[PDB]
């Protein structure tokens, strides 16, 4: 097999490998697809020693083999050994993009037109995801891929779940859904992250970061995150506190000194006022008052792009030991075997 930095065993269809970045359970390489005559991205996955790794791998494969959308990076091919006995790694082949938004924001200032088009595409893909009754649950700049003409695709469905709003409530300081800087305040207070509003919060964080090239809520550790959120939003209203029935969470908030809201136009003095109006609606403390994806698409900031007939939804929404998970991954990837069927 061809090797990179480890086995990267994708041949002979895929050749001339170059290291790019990293997935969760392995490295990402670009490669030349000798059949389609285009370069592609390939993610190496080694999940089978651990249930949780197997879960995340299987979840993504199940979701992406059903999803088809311009703003979601799909699965082009899956490479693995012909038998469960010989299967150790799994390689997922996807479109080769130019960069991710994390890397881009490290050095490039976005024009307002770029922010608008990027945000439109994030929400257009998110509309499709949410219409399938699925939550991405880890939206962040490094999961947003851009090609050379600034078309955007959402990556990594390994953390996704089927939405379950009726079972979303939990206790205080127990949940860790999403990546810290993009994590909604209710995750720390009373939410398992099973409602669509979790993703809208993350998109609001991404919008703020596109406006200034810095994370808006850069918590330095799990417990610091809520300090940053409340430092900008200010103290929650009585009505929003009354919506938090859990006593530990509500009394924690009641114990805090009053904090003023920081106006968005003072944080972002060069931003488009329509962008800040939408930002405010996405970064609303109360998840029931937070804007939903279809409302966000219809917001005046996005009026140059908004077209509900060109914002498709999913045809087939989702309704609901590692040894069996390995077997399930083997079965779910069978369609890509050369002599599959
Ligand atoms: C996309 C999700 C993922 O694994 C994240 O860690 C991303 O940040 C990794 C991005 C790798 C990458 C980088 C470039 O420049 C281009 C492309 O196409 C990718 C890519 O496709 O990725 C996916 C394999 C994973």
Asked if residue 122 lies in contact with residue 203, where contact means CB atoms within 8 angstroms, the answer is yes
How many angstroms separate the CA atoms of 284 and 205, rounded?
11
Place of tokens 């490669």: 31
Structure determined via: X-ray
Q: Are strands 77-79 and 38-45 parallel, antiparallel or unpaired?
A: unpaired
CA angle 183, 59, 40 (to 5 degrees): 95
Place of tokens 């038998």: 83
CA distances to 43, 166, 175, 248 from 172, in Å: 36, 18, 8, 6
Provide the CA 42 distance to its chain's centre, in angstroms.
Answer: 19
Contacts of residue 47, defined as CB under 8 A and 6 or more positions apart, other chains included, come to 25, 53, 54, 56, 57, 90, 329
**Does 138 qualify as catalytic in the annotation?**
yes
Task: Answer yes or no: is 160 a known binding residue.
Answer: no
Place of tokens 């219409």: 131
- Closest to 176 measured CA to CA, from 156, 196, 157, 193: 193
Residues after which the chain is broken (C–N above 2.5 A) are 5, 320
Burial class (CB in 10 A: 0-12, 13-18, 19+), 316: exposed
Based on the domain organization, do 246 and 129 belong to the same domain? yes
How many angstroms separate the CA atoms of 158 and 90, rounded?
14
Q: For ligand 1, atom 17, which residue shows the shortest CA distance?
A: 97
Beta-bridge partner residues of 99? 146
Based on the domain organization, do 60 and 125 belong to the same domain? no
Based on the domain organization, do 80 and 3 belong to the same domain? yes
Based on the domain organization, do 127 and 195 belong to the same domain? yes
- Please give the structure tokens belonging to residue 281: 């609606």
Based on the domain organization, do 225 and 102 belong to the same domain? yes
Contacts of residue 138, defined as CB under 8 A and 6 or more positions apart, other chains included, come to 156, 158, 159, 178, 179, 182, 202
Q: Ligand 1: which atom is nearest the Cα of residue 92?
A: 24
Q: Which domain holds residue 72?
A: 1-96+321-338
SS3 37: coil
Query: Residues for the chain: how many in total?
Result: 341
- DSSP H or E run through 61: helix 51-66
Beta-bridge partner residues of 93? 42, 77
Based on the domain organization, do 163 and 283 belong to the same domain? yes
Q: What CATH number should be reported for the domain holding residue 20?
A: 3.30.200.20
Model resolution, angstroms: 1.5
Q: Domain count of the chain?
A: 2
DSSP category for residue 142: G
Based on the domain organization, do 84 and 128 belong to the same domain? no
- Closest to 254 measured CA to CA, from 263, 266, 244, 264: 244
Distance 77 CA to ligand 1 centre (A): 15
What Rg value do the Cα atoms of the chain yield, rounded?
21
Q: For ligand 1, atom 3, which residue shows the shortest CA distance?
A: 23
Q: For ligand 1, atom 20, which residue shows the shortest CA distance?
A: 41
Q: Are strands 99-100 and 90-95 parallel, antiparallel or unpaired?
A: unpaired
Based on the domain organization, do 119 and 194 belong to the same domain? yes
CA distances to 12, 14, 27, 116, 337 from 8, in Å: 11, 10, 9, 38, 18
Place of tokens 């609901």: 320
Q: For ligand 1, atom 8, which residue shows the shortest CA distance?
A: 142
Where do the DSSP E strands lie in 26-89? 27-33, 38-45, 77-79
SS3 341: coil
How many angstroms separate the CA atoms of 24 and 45, rounded?
8
Based on the domain organization, do 130 and 83 belong to the same domain? no
Distance 40 CA to ligand 1 centre (A): 11
Based on the domain organization, do 315 and 333 belong to the same domain? no
Provide the CA 43 distance to its chain's centre, in angstroms.
Answer: 17
How many angstroms separate the CA atoms of 67 and 74, rounded?
7
Contacts of residue 168, defined as CB under 8 A and 6 or more positions apart, other chains included, come to 191, 192, 193, 194, 195
Q: Which residues line ligand 1 (CB under 6 A)?
A: 20-23, 28, 41, 43, 73, 94, 96-97, 99-100, 142-143, 145, 155-156
Task: Answer yes or no: is 23 a known binding residue.
Answer: yes
How many angstroms separate the CA atoms of 235 and 229, rounded?
10
The single residue of 138, 156, 168, 199 carrying the catalytic annotation is: 138
Based on the domain organization, do 129 and 73 belong to the same domain? no
Based on the domain organization, do 153 and 218 belong to the same domain? yes
Q: What CATH number should be reported for the domain holding residue 226?
A: 1.10.510.10
């Amino acid at each position: 097999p061809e090797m990179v930095r480890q086995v990267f065993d994708v041949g002979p269809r895929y050749t001339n490998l170059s290291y790019i970045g990293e997935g969760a359970y392995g490295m990402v390489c670009s490669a030349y697809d000798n059949l389609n005559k285009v370069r592609v991205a390939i993610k190496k996955i080694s999940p089978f020693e651990h249930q949780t790794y197997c879960q995340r791998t299987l979840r993504e494969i199940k979701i992406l083999l059903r999803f088809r959308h311009e703003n979601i990076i799909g699965i082009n091919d899956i490479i693995r050994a012909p038998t469960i006995e010989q299967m150790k790694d799994v390689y997922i082949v996807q479109d080769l993009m130019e960069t991710d938004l994390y890397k881009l924001l490290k050095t490039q200032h976005l024009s307002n037109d770029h922010i608008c088009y990027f945000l439109y595409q994030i929400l257009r893909g998110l509309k499709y995801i949410h219409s399938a009754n699925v939550l991405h649950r880890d939206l962040k700049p490094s999961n947003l891929l851009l090609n050379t003409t600034c078309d955007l695709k959402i990556c990594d469905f390994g953390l996704a779940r089927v939405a379950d709003p009726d079972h979303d409530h939990t206790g205080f300081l127990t949940e860790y859904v999403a990546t810290r800087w993009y994590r909604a305040p209710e995750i720390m207070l009373n939410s398992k992250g099973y409602t669509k509003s979790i993703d809208i919060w993350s998109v609001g964080c991404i919008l703020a970061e596109m406006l200034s090239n810095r994370p808006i809520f850069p918590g330095k550790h799990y417990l610091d995150q809520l300090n940053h959120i409340l430092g900008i939003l200010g103290s929650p209203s009585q009505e929003d506190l009354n919506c938090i029935i859990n006593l530990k969470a509500r009394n924690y908030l009641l114990s805090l000194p009053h904090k003023n809201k920081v106006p968005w136009n003072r944080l972002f003095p060069n931003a488009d006022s329509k962008a800040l109006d939408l930002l405010d609606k996405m970064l609303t403390f109360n998840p029931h008052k937070r804007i939903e994806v279809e409302q966000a698409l219809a917001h005046p900031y996005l009026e140059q792009y908004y077209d509900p007939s060109d914002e498709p939804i999913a045809e087939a929404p989702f309704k609901f030991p590692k040894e069996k998970l390995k077997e399930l991954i083997f079965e779910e990837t069978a369609r890509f075997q050369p002599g599959y069927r």
